[PDB]
Write a protein that binds this ligand. Structure first.
Ligand code: VDX
Length: 253
């Protein structure tokens, strides 16, 4: 069976596409406003040197902080999100922030050279640039594999935005009060996605794709946990707080 998208479902997709278009600048034109990226000579991938300098942290922390703000904006536009209490809204945002950033970054990720390309060389982020931000390969390598796998799904933008929405509105986040309401909202979203794939996504991908996308959400949980572990280590570095931002400190602290 391939039930047609209901008027409500079509409206949901429209709202999410619009929300994404208003919160994700494909030209990355604001990036020049972030603290400048600095790339020290670390061909050896020296953890000691990376931690001593954290040369790329101010820039990437600003990029992440900026992205969290955009995600907050996107989330507020998710149909039903505002029906939740502010406490639940914040619980969901803080817990999904890094995951949505990883998902949305797939738009700048390119398999041409396995980097996040957001402009000229200055705004091209490679594994080496992330390690220069004090991040561990224990996180970055799996992150890259995740990006490639997500790339290969060749998601329509409709699927991309629905996946980010579903990621955010997850009832199984620690601290949520009204898990029931959250699940109802997510189910409305998941049903839209499943319905969209079944009647709009041409094979060989008409089906099976929903399962692959849901698996990505599971992968994201592991990446989230891995990032939290690495962020903790990074936080031990003296003077690190100044290289981050208040929003970043709050979300991951
Ligand atoms: C942000 C966005 C972009 C890229 C994402 C990247 C590339 C650089 C390194 C990042 C920011 C990863 C880092 C492991 C996260 C480190 C954060 C912290 C220093 C606080 O522990 C996660 C996603 C990666 C650019 C654009 O796609 C908008 C998107 O929204």
């Amino acid at each position: 069976l391939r039930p047609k998208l209901s008027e409500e479902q079509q409206r949901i997709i429209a709202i999410l596409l619009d929300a994404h278009h208003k919160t994700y600048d494909p030209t990355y034109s604001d990036f020049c406003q972030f603290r400048p990226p600095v790339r020290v000579n670390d061909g050896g991938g020296s953890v000691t040197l990376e931690l001593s300098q954290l040369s790329m942290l101010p820039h990437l922390a600003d990029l992440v902080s900026y992205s969290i703000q955009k995600v907050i904006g996107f989330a507020k536009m998710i149909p039903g999100f505002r029906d939740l209490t502010s406490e639940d809204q914040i619980v969901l945002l803080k817990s999904s922030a890094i995951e949505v950033i990883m998902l949305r970054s797939n738009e700048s990720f390119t398999m041409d050279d396995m980097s996040w390309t957001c402009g000229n060389q200055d705004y091209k982020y490679r594994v080496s640039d992330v390690t220069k931000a004090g991040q561990s390969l224990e996180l970055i390598e799996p992150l890259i594999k995740f990006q490639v796998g997500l790339k290969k799904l060749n998601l329509h933008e409709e699927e991309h935005v629905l996946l980010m929405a579903i990621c955010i509105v997850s009832p199984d986040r620690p601290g949520v009060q009204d898990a029931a309401l959250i699940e109802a909202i997510q189910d409305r979203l998941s049903n839209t996605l499943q319905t969209y794939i079944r009647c709009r996504h041409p094979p060989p991908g008409s089906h099976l794709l929903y399962a692959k996308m849901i698996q990505k959400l599971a992968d994201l949980r592991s990446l989230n946990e891995e990032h939290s572990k690495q962020y903790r280590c990074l936080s031990f570095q003296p003077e690190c707080s100044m290289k981050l931002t208040p929003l970043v400190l709050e979300v991951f602290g």
